[PDB]
């Protein structure tokens, strides 16, 4: 079935920004720069930060790293590998509803917030119908992903800050921790202290 239709909403990413490089421009981590080993570390760390927010040694995917380092795969392939990883499934899929999982995916992969509940609703059914991989591939193959990040750049949160303002929109790793009230209740938190 075709994806349920929904309308956009006004967003920074939807309009021309007249951007000039500053300390608030997301760093472009691309393999098109022929990155040295240490510089490849930073690109890999950036990808872990973008997708996981933090990769403990348990979370890391050393074989995917080697393949990216060797040119076997593109950055987008590395990002897919992270999205397909055990850490991503366990942290962001299993601990959330399909609706919140979609939000995480849109935020992490496309670098923007969702338009509305209806966008979350429309995509929530994709895992069930096309399978988990089908959802990731749709987003990674989307014109929005490719136009912004292509094959060789680590995705990032887009147009978060506007010039001359003290603060931007909330970073997604603050706005969207890996789980929320639903899983918090199951764990029996918050803990009464004192």
């Amino acid at each position: 079935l075709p994806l349920l239709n929904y309308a956009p909403k006004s967003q920074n990413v939807r309009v021309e920004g007249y951007e000039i490089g500053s300390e608030e421009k997301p760093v472009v981590f691309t393999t098109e720069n022929i990155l040295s080993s240490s510089d490849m570390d930073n690109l890999i760390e950036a990808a872990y930060r973008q997708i996981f927010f933090h990769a403990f040694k348990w979370d890391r995917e050393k074989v995917l790293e080697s393949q990216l380092r060797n040119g076997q795969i593109t950055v987008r392939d590395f990002v897919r590998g992270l999205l397909l990883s055990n850490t991503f499934r366990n942290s962001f899929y299993e601990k959330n509803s399909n609706y919140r999982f979609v939000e995480h995916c849109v935020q992490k992969i496309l670098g923007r917030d969702v338009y509305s509940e209806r966008e979350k609703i429309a995509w929530s059914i994709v895992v069930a119908t096309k399978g988990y991989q089908g959802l990731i591939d749709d987003l990674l193959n989307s014109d929005e992903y490719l136009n912004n990040f292509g094959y060789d750049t680590v995705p990032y949160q887009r147009r978060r800050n506007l010039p001359g303002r003290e603060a931007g929109e909330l970073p997604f790793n603050i706005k969207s921790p890996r789980y929320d009230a639903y899983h918090r209740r199951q764990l029996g938190f918050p803990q009464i202290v004192w």
Binding site: I34, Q72, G81, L146
Partner: protein
Amino acid sequence: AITTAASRLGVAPYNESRPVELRPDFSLDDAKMVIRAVYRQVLGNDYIMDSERLKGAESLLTNGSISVREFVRTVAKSELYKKKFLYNNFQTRVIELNYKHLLGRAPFSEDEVIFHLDLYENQGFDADIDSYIDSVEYQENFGENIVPYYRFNNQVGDRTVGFTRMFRLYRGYANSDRSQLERSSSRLATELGQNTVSAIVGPSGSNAGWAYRPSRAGNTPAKALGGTVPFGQASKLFRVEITAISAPGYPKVRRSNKAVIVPFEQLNQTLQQINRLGGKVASITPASL
């Protein structure tokens, strides 16, 4: 032989040609045909100006004072050959060209580079030229009386790597060794040193992706080490070489040439994306087992 792909590979005209032999008691038209063939073969299909012709060597050939092989030898040792192919080239480039012109094939191994580089360095260009012409291989294929010609077809003594490398040196019929995209650069220095080969990209006109050439660094390896694991559920992997990428523009597009390894299940998406990049498929090759 080469039949179905002959035309797109630029081989069909050579399939349609016979070796140019100078028979004993040859006629003058025979001598003219040899002279034309030798100039086209040995000088890599460069245009030859009347002022550049080797009139004396042509006279001696016409008179039977020198055989075909000795005429080839004279052309190869001439200031004309050296100006075209020696004075401006890395010696590995020179060796590539000598092999193409005088033996009609590409070098097989690094050992050939070692031999000819040392011979040039120790005894000079003339000595090196003689080694090609006095070689067993030259004798067996061309002998005294036949102009050298491209040996596309499989022969005794061949190696497969020779076949792929001929299309690094031969770039089509309406083309010369001095009018190719890589210009003066050695085509095979890296292939020989690493004993690797490259996917064959046929000549322009009959192949949209004819211009695909890899960069110095940051290339995609030939084979999919790691298999399908990084791609998730995938049946088989292919290496696609893509050229002429322009549409997004810089900095979204950095290098117009790119090779990607993609799964079978994304080939439809890949071709669609390539088209929208403006790019042209140069080659597709299975990358996994």
